[PDB]
Amino acid sequence: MTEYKLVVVGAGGVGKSALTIQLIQNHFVDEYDPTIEDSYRKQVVIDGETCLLDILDTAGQEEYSAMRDQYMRTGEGFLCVFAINNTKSFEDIHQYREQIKRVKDSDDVPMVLVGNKCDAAARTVESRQAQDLARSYGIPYIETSAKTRQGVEDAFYTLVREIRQH
Ligand SMILES: Nc1nc2c(ncn2[C@@H]2O[C@H](COP(=O)(O)OP(=O)(O)NP(=O)(O)O)[C@@H](O)[C@H]2O)c(=O)[nH]1
Ligand SMILES: [Ca+2]
Ligand SMILES: [Ca+2]
Ligand SMILES: [Mg+2]
């Protein structure tokens, strides 16, 4: 069966782990335990193909920025996550997209932009602003909530579909 190596990146606290755990384990993690580097595996059927997803959940706390480079090198596609109630996390995306281009040494890496926490009441990043950033990179934008599970499968499965176009 086909294996896809996916990496989830973005600032601290935006919900990378909650998104991943919703996908893999079908529950919402309410507490905040910062991640170092965790890996998950799951067999799924996507568009009639039996796939193995190997997901690397990375640290957003900038103390681990150096260790991240070597883990990210093996990734085939990246989920770049910000939170729609955290303007700085959106402004930080550009940096993660530069780190990816450095570790992969390529300008054409499969990637999806994810605006998480779309259940939150205090939105400061409008959908149009994120669509414009995604358009500049040539990638899809999807909004998610790890809390309600909205968009979670869509975000990960769209990333697989992007890997398949490359
Ligand atoms: N309301 C809401 N809260 C969320 C959502 N996703 C994550 N959270 C909450 O935000 C906090 C941080 O989530 P977490 O997934 O640990 O963030 P992270 O990006 O993995 N942090 P780190 O980079 O430090 O590992 C948790 O309290 C979690 O419940 C969401 O979609 N909606
Ligand atoms: Ca819970
Ligand atoms: Ca985490
Ligand atoms: Mg504004």
Residue numbers in the entry: 1 to 166
Paper passage:
Consider, for example, the Ras proteins, which are prototypical members of a superfamily of membrane-associated small G-proteins that control an extraordinary range of cellular processes. Ras proteins are capable of producing a diversity of signaling outputs by binding to effector proteins, most importantly to the Raf family of kinases, which activate the MAP kinase pathway. Ras proteins cycle between an active GTP-bound state that transduces signals by binding to effector proteins, and an inactive GDP-bound state that cannot bind to effectors. The switch between the GDP- and GTP-bound states is accompanied by correlated conformational changes distributed throughout the structure of Ras. Two segments of Ras, referred to as Switch I and Switch II, undergo substantial rearrangements when GTP is replaced by GDP, as illustrated schematically in Figure 1 (for a comprehensive review, see Vetter and Wittinghofer, 2001).
Leu 120 is in the guanine-binding loop, with the sidechain in van der Waals contact with the edge of the nucleotide base. Mutations at the base of Switch I (H27G), in helix α5 (Y157A), and in distal regions of the guanine binding loops (L120A), increase the rate of intrinsic nucleotide release. We found that the transition between the R and T states can be triggered by one of the hotspot mutations identified in our study, L120A. We determined the structure of wild-type Ras•GTP and the L120A variant at room temperature, both crystallized with the same crystallographic lattice, and found that wild-type Ras•GTP is in the R state, whereas the L120A mutant is in the T state (there is evidence in the electron density for a minor population of the R state, with an occupancy of 20% or less). The two conformational states have been denoted ‘R’ (assumed to be competent for GTP hydrolysis, although this has not been established definitively) and ‘T’ (assumed to be inactive in terms of GTP hydrolysis). Crystal structure of the L120A mutant shows a rotation of Tyr 71, whereby the sidechain is exposed. Additionally, the interface between helix α3 and Switch II undergoes a conformational change. Helix α3 and the C-terminal helix of Switch II shift downwards in the transition from the R state to the T state, leading to a rotation of Tyr 71 from a buried to an exposed conformation. S. rosetta Ras adopts the T state, similar to L120A, where Tyr 71 is rotated outwards and exposed.
